[PDB]
Amino acid sequence: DIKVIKRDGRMVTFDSSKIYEAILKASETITPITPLIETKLEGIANRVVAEINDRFSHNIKIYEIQSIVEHELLEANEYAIAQEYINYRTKRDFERSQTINKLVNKDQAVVHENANKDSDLYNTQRDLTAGIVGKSVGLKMLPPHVANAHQKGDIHFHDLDYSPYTPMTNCCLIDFKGMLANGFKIGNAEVESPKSIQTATAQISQIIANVASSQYGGCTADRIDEFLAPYAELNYKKHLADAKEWVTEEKQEDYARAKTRKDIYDAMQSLEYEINTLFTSNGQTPFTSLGFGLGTNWFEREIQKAILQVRILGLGSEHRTAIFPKLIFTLKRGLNLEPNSPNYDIKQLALECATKRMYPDVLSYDKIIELTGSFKAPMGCRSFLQGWKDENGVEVNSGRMNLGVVTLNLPRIALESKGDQDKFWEIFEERMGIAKDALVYRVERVKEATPANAPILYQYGAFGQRLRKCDSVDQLFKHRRATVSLGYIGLYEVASVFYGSDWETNLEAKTFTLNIVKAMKNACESWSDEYDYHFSVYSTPSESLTDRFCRLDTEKFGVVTDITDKEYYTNSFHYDVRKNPTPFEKLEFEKDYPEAGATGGFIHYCEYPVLQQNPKALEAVWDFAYDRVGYLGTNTPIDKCYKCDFEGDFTPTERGFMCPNCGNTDPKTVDVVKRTCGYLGNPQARPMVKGRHKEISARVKHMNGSTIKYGGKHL
Amino acid sequence: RVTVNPDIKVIKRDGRMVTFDSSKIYEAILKASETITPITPLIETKLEGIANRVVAEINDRFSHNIKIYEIQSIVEHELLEANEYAIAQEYINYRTKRDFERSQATDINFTINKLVNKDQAVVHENSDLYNTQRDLTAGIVGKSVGLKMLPPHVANAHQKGDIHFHDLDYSPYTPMTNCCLIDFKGMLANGFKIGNAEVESPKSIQTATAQISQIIANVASSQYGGCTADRIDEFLAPYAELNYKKHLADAKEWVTEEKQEDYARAKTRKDIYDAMQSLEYEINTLFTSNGQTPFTSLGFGLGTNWFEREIQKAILQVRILGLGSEHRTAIFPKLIFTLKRGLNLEPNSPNYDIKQLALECATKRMYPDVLSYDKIIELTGSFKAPMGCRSFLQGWKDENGVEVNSGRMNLGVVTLNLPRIALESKGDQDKFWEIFEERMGIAKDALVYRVERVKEATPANAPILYQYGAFGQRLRKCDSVDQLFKHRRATVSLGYIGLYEVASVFYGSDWETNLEAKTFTLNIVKAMKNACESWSDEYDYHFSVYSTPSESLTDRFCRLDTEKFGVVTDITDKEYYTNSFHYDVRKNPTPFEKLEFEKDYPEAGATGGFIHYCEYPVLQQNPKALEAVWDFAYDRVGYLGTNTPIDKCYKCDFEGDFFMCPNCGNTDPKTVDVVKRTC
Ligand SMILES: Nc1ncnc2c1ncn2[C@H]1C[C@H](O)[C@@H](COP(=O)(O)OP(=O)(O)OP(=O)(O)O)O1
Ligand SMILES: Nc1ncnc2c1ncn2[C@H]1C[C@H](O)[C@@H](COP(=O)(O)OP(=O)(O)OP(=O)(O)O)O1
Ligand SMILES: Nc1ncnc2c1ncn2[C@H]1C[C@H](O)[C@@H](COP(=O)(O)OP(=O)(O)OP(=O)(O)O)O1
Ligand SMILES: Nc1ncnc2c1ncn2[C@H]1C[C@H](O)[C@@H](COP(=O)(O)OP(=O)(O)OP(=O)(O)O)O1
Ligand SMILES: Nc1ncnc2c1ncn2[C@H]1C[C@H](O)[C@@H](COP(=O)(O)OP(=O)(O)OP(=O)(O)O)O1
Ligand SMILES: Nc1ncnc2c1ncn2[C@H]1C[C@H](O)[C@@H](COP(=O)(O)OP(=O)(O)OP(=O)(O)O)O1
Ligand SMILES: [Mg+2]
Ligand SMILES: [Mg+2]
Ligand SMILES: [Mg+2]
Ligand SMILES: [Mg+2]
Ligand SMILES: [Zn+2]
Ligand SMILES: [Zn+2]
Structure with a gap:
């Protein structure tokens, strides 16, 4: 040295x-x-x-x-x-x-945090320039008042790097059932229907990689255990025919049953690893969701089990936690919710998986139907389609998409209100009109697309119906088939302006936050009649918005106590992450907001300690949640330092997360997994912005217990 | 003092x-x-x-x-x-x-604001996918920034058309490299990290080929050139053997003892075919940020045992069968079959059955191209398949005296516009060598710059290449990437084009029979070879003469020269430049005549990149005729590619070369299968 x-x-x-x-x-x-x-x-x-x-x-x-x-x-x-x-x-x-010199212009005097020439992937670096051009040109394509409101921070026009520069859509439920059935053209090849489940999961990941680059949002495989099971039956028939030629007569059925079990596990093992090797133009993995749980026969049950035990096993020899795809297990009364139900053994497996990998989130089969009009997994992170039927009265969920998101800075409206709720609604109506203009422009812009722009979506079954090159893409959007997201954030801050930091027990304060959601739902219902697209209230994920809105409001209003001082905004309708209600009180408080109109997008989190040796504590929250909330996520410390074998909750710092035992921050030798918003993230691999990191650091646990699973060794 | x-x-x-x-x-x-x-x-x-x-x-x-x-x-x-x-x-x-x-001058925020507002140019060419549309703007920014980063005399030479600085969309804006032979053998054996997964060694050939296609996808995004799996039948065989090992174990538990061996054999043969089928289909569904399929190649043919033979047959069988229910010809990956005397060349050789299969494949499709095992060793110092299109590494032993081929790469290409130099001579070869010496020095300055640029890369910019085995040795984040480039390990490409046009300027249209006209063109290659050898001693990187693929460069040089010199007879009047040293495409020599004429040019020093094309009508749907050309080529040339297959109209069911269709006039690429060589 x-x-x-x-x-x-x-x-x-x-x-x-x-x-x-x-x-x-x-x-x-x-x-x-x-x-x-x-x-x-x-x-x-x-x-x-x-x-x-x-x-x-x-x-x-x-x-x-x-x-x-x-x-x-x-x-x-x-x-x-x-x-x-x-x-x-x-x-x-x-x-x-x-000083000795001065040689920096006003725009180069700031540290650009999302641009590291020495650290970033090449495609990340080049796509950065495409996003700068896209956002710059896109801001001139918007209606000027919509563009001004975005720049000031009154609203947030989402995904300016991609829209309106391209007529891209947001998220969707991929109609995998229609695609795998008839075959499809992808890239240079036009594949045929898969003849096994291994070929089927291979085609799924290739469909996802294509869909991920034709849209700026995530995509979900709804009911994957159900449409994959027929292809696993082909495997059984194969192995059964092989057993006739080679296997003893008394062993032919055990042979085909055992080989098909391994085939199902290998196919889902491939789906797990391949999704984690995919990437979009920015170098990041595609935002993907897998929904399952409603299958009943042996093949559907084995696919559910193989998905969970693959996630339980982990990625690689270090058994790291797979951050993608998001797994969403469906709970249904009579199917897997009760200890006497036939699929209850799978519920106990998903409980084990959630205590070790946080995923799967759980859906309430009935509460989802009540909130959204029909059952389906959310598109991407948390966007829900409303119940919709085609011309023949047939219910259609998979194959439908979302057209864009615009989010209102609600705490700003409260801070401009000066404690006068009459002024709040006056400003609220003005901001709603700007958001309506922005959403209508998004619908117009996306309709300018052409089937040749995204053949996997418009021509080969991902959006359900295949169009010709001459057909209009609006044929798959109109008559409320597509949804449009009216977003919001920070109802806690809105209430704290008028009712203080402990308003949760004030009914008049709660009523105010609920009336805000109802007002947004009222306008969305009106917009849906005016333009015949489904506008819905969307609980915008605070992955970047919590920092941007809080940063812009700190410049405009200063350090406001309990609002901007904490350097983040609370997500949508969620309970103040700093307070520590029980998981039962939290869900009972929050359940009113999706029922009031926030059904276009929503989720519920709870903060647990190490629950690996106590899954029944988590099961009490799932059972409690079944009749009250539709979409529940589980947060539990599952970090791991590979230098001292520490397992538990890493201590957050100003620089990220370090090991509580030796202080290790090297992402090569630590596995830190935190819930960003709906999705999970690796804050040591791709660090979050300061505001998002502040919100994560401010989260307290909701039930008592230890945040240490393995204390580690003395180095 | x-x-x-x-x-x-x-x-x-x-x-x-x-x-x-x-x-x-x-x-x-x-x-x-x-x-x-x-x-x-x-x-x-x-x-x-x-x-x-x-x-x-x-x-x-x-x-x-x-x-x-x-x-x-x-x-x-x-x-x-x-x-x-x-x-x-x-x-x-x-x-x-x-x-x-x-x-x-490398900052984007300065130049992106100028690109959208005032002085910077956007339309600079003289496409429906969204990722393609977004990639266009990344290349516009990259080319605009790159032109300001180059040494000014290099940028001027490129814009005028004196040289061509390849891949301005990607470099020098990023310190990306060009093409490589991926060291699959090292990655699959020792495991690697890709995306968010630190995968272990494959326990089957199905998992092996799945990891290969994902490695290829990640490598294709860390570089702007093609990648190649060299000797794929050989390094995949140990993983096909694991399939046999576990099939024989299952046979002991489920199958009667008399059938146990036949069970493991039959199931393993099917696993091999299924794995190679996945490699075929998964490569064609890959795409880079521009939406195009990555240029990829598979080299194979030297395997001898049962597993290696089955992998070779499966590759050819899958390609013969085609893609989808319509059995379309797969254009990617390029198949490169290795002929070797004593292994598969003569009819008594043990792998001659595979050569017969390869001949049928190359006839019904276009690939596989063939490599003369002995000639490649003579021309490039060792045996290896070409990286990407046709870029050959030279023989090279590492610091431990071990011969290394996979894991090495090329750092960039700069092509001289030779026909322009001939036109600028005004009929005087004395001025040609004077202008040739000047353009030579400019190309040297550009190539030296590319090497200095790629050395600025950090291992974290491309972990799949520098940290997890694609380039052989694995580096730490605090190391220099030059460790994998220096001591002649990486190659640098000095390109040229249009030896026919150059000779025709000084000797007329039919110079091929003129002995002094060929000696002149051969002296141009020798002058490039000697210069590259000198540059290699100076900077300790392997500069080599590279027969640049035509692609769009043959149209850029010809279009810029037509604006500069007008319609010159036999030069720019045909609206294209003949590729490198190739025979005049308008003339129709026999395959044996063509190969006898062209074999001198790689022998003269054009060994960093070369290929020999034969498009003879008798070779169509005629495996026997193709075998005559392969056999004749084995002792003379190193790398041979045969006819393109007949373009098929899936409506009306016509087969020919057509674009439209003679039997109807269809132009829809969904019902039309046109096969063309990418390079
Ligand atoms: N031991 C070391 N190893 C590597 N770099 C070092 C070391 N000591 C100092 N440096 C480098 C890092 C900085 O670029 C530069 C100045 O750092 P600094 O810590 O102020 O050093 P110094 O010698 O001035 O010490 P001090 O200010 O404590 O007397 O010296
Ligand atoms: N306030 C600052 N602003 C900018 N750079 C700083 C500042 N403080 C320290 N640095 C950087 C530049 C210094 O070279 C380096 C080491 O700090 P420091 O020891 O103060 O300086 P130095 O090593 O140049 O001088 P010295 O050792 O004589 O005090 O850290
Ligand atoms: N890994 C893959 N990824 C994508 N497409 C694939 C893959 N493997 C095969 N395909 C294509 C080829 C066919 O057009 C179609 C059906 O594949 P597959 O289920 O393997 O059937 P097959 O006709 O090859 O029969 P079998 O494998 O059952 O003998 O999918
Ligand atoms: N050949 C050389 N020998 C020694 N020092 C040199 C040489 N070339 C440059 N330098 C040093 C001297 C100065 O400290 C520094 C800058 O000098 P300068 O002549 O401007 O170099 P340069 O490479 O920037 O050239 P120019 O400005 O002419 O293009 O580089
Ligand atoms: N006007 C000046 N004032 C102070 N120092 C100077 C001046 N001109 C030249 N020098 C010194 C410092 C420079 O590094 C060195 C070489 O001159 P010059 O080539 O102009 O600069 P440079 O090499 O830093 O930049 P360039 O990139 O333009 O070559 O001589
Ligand atoms: N389709 C795939 N794509 C990428 N990586 C994969 C795929 N399938 C498995 N892997 C990873 C998981 C392991 O880290 C490594 C070895 O895979 P594999 O050979 O399937 O082993 P294994 O442990 O699953 O055993 P087996 O499949 O024999 O039960 O490759
Ligand atoms: Mg100091
Ligand atoms: Mg496996
Ligand atoms: Mg200077
Ligand atoms: Mg198959
Ligand atoms: Zn530690
Ligand atoms: Zn036709």
């Missing part, structure tokens, strides 16, 4: 952190450290070490290290941190021997 | 190694001083004393080369040692100003 020559002459040992901490001090003079800046600095620090060993062999001087640090800062295009580092380092060199 | 170590060379910012020149240091210090006070003899004495301390420190801190910023660091250091704080302040301020402005 190379030694370092100090300025006085003595030789010290190469301490790599002296480079990082130097760069850190220069960055902190511009803006406080964040998880995103942390990985940016660590990547730049690695390049410095690389250049040092590439340009020097036995020793290196201090000023030689300084010239590499400044050189690598300019090679990474970090002009703001470089200007600070160079001026300070130069000032100290002049002082030891006895 | 201190003398610099003569073993030290200055590495310019664009990668060029130049002679050390202490006057460059003195003049720099002088320019900073003149901004403060006029020069005086007393100041000169101080400035040349400082320059001496700079050269002494250089000799004290570096042994072989030194970068520009390392010299500047010493200049600023010694200025502060000499207590010339006024000069040092002016020098640092000016040097830092130029360093920032130089980095801002």
